Amino acid sequence: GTTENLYFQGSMSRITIERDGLTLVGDREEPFGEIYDMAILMHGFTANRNTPLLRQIADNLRDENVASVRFDFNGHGESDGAFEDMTVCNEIADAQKILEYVRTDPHVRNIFLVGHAQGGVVASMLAGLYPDIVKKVVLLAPAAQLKDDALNGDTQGATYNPEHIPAAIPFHGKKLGGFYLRTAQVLPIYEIAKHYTNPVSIIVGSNDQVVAPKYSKKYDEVYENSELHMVPDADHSFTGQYKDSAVDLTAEFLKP
Amino acid sequence: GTTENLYFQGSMSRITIERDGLTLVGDREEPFGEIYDMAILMHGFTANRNTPLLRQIADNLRDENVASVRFDFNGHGESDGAFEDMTVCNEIADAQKILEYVRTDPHVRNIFLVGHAQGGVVASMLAGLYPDIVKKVVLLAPAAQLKDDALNGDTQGATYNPEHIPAAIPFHGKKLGGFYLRTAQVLPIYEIAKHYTNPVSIIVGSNDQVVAPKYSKKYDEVYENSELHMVPDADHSFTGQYKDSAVDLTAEFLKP
Ligand SMILES: CCOC(=O)/C=C/c1ccc(O)c(OC)c1
Ligand SMILES: CCOC(=O)/C=C/c1ccc(O)c(OC)c1
């Protein structure tokens, strides 16, 4: 009475890519098979490509025969660049080189974007710039609030005059670029995101203490083909018990 | 009978600066003195920092005791980076590192921007992001048309589907990045430039056949404190006779 139950199948690769003289470091996960859809997974502000959330997303996508790549943004994790030089704009430039890496790959069928938080802002504006290429987008707690906070001169507790932004501000151990804050103020987030008319899923925790729920709702009102999933009680980063519910909504939207 | 006519006084330095792991190469010109105003001079699309126009502007500013720096943008002249990776966005990032270099210099009093054509677009966007820092701006045939052309699918004769832009398009023997064109299409040129309320002088040739002078008129309408100088018969580049008129209006506006 022997049983055998397959739970893991495929390949995992450490990838490096160049953007303007910076090395970006990523992990590629593929299922077995010559052709597969491929998701680009994008982390949040001060996070990295190997959060529990993004690992579990790559794992459950692979179970559904969907490949994934997840890169450290410039100034984060193992990728090059000073944290203080990172902006939402140069993270969009990182994501574009990753999209070109994937679009050029002979194994790939359709390209999906998955962005958590600031990674969700990046994903939404990349999709707006490549709506001909991106087939599905998942936004998790997309952090469009970073624009309103930069305009109000209050970024998660760090205060500054929004009309005389310093060169850099102290931020929880780190140095946040004046340029991050000046570009955040004028980011055409919703203006660019609305060019993407293909399917979008927006996943938000009811208990998100970092980004107000209003931001996710505005994405839902601006997208032609959106669904909005409010996960009861979930936190900002979908941690512990809330990880599984974000992963299940992601995998179920992207699966063949 | 003795005559003495001074025709050159100051210091010229070759500068290099880093932006995201790219070296940018520039020429710095100063007059004699411990404290001076400093103009950042910004070249156009496929040009470099040593066009006749920009050398003569640096020369005439130094005679009026105004220092200047002129850098090759990424993908141009002697600077790092492939032409095909250049966007308007990453030239604004180049210009921000130049602004930081100049703003950090103990000799520099007030900072002026001077931008020709695409350089004018860059200068206008940087001034909008740093309206608290930039004291004067001169735009010479600012090429805000690059947005409308990208949306039309016709960039100086290079044609493409504006909703399915290729990875790169052949462009006068070089390769122009798809990302240049997709970001050109959504650039909030006038919306960002508007935030600059200090003095601006806009210098346009009535016979510009590369950028419609209407784009310079639009800047004049958008700015709080602008003057418009339409140079009868002058071409896009301000070649020959037209160079002295462009130089003279620049030096007159910035002089102490
Ligand atoms: C992308 C990971 O981002 C988050 O987890 C939260 C984002 C966030 C929210 C408000 C802000 O003012 C902000 O400015 C830097 C960022
Ligand atoms: C900045 C130097 O730029 C020029 O001399 C002219 C620029 C120009 C005009 C129309 C365009 O569609 C364009 O697309 C790249 C560029």
Numbering used by the authors:
A (entry chain A), B (entry chain B): -10 to 245
Give sentences copied directly from the paper behind this entry:
We also resolved the crystal structure of ethyl ferulate-bound LaFae mutant (S106A) at 2.19 Å resolution and analyzed its substrate binding mode. Ethyl ferulate complexed LaFae crystallized in the C121 space group with four molecules in an asymmetric unit. In a close-up view of the substrate binding site of the complex structure, the electron density map (contoured at 1.0 σ) of ethyl ferulate was observed near the S106A mutation position. Notably, the carbonyl group of ethyl ferulate was discovered to interact directly with the NE2 atom of His225 at a 2.5 Å distance and the 4′-hydroxyl group of ethyl ferulate also formed hydrogen bonds with Asp138 at a 2.4 Å distance. The substrate-binding pocket of LaFae comprised of hydrophobic residues F34 and V200 and polar residues Q107, Q134, D138, T144, Q145, Y169, D197 and H225. A structural superposition of the ligand-free form and ethyl ferulate-bound LaFae yielded a root-mean-square deviation value of 0.261 Å over 209 residues, indicating a highly similar overall structure. In the substrate-bound conformation, two anti-parallel β strands formed a sheet within the cap domain (α5–α6 loop region of the apo structure). Additionally, the comparative b-factor analysis showed that the binding of ethyl ferulate caused a reduced structural flexibility on the α5–α6 loop region. It is thought that this loop region plays a role in the open/close movement of LaFae when the substrate is bound. Furthermore, the conformational change of the cap domain region in substrate-free, as well as the ethyl ferulate bound structure, presented open and closed movements of LaFae when harboring ethyl ferulate as a substrate.
Feruloyl esterases (FAEs, E.C. 3.1.1.73), a subfamily of carboxylic acid esterases, are mainly associated with the release and exploitation of HCAs from plant cell walls. In this study, we aimed to obtain and characterize a feruloyl esterase (LaFae) from Lactobacillus acidophilus. To further investigate the active site configuration of LaFae, crystal structures of unliganded and ethyl ferulate-bound LaFae were determined at 2.3 and 2.19 Å resolutions, respectively. Seven α-helices surround the β-sheets and form a core domain that contains an active site with conserved catalytic triad residues (Ser106, Asp197 and His225).
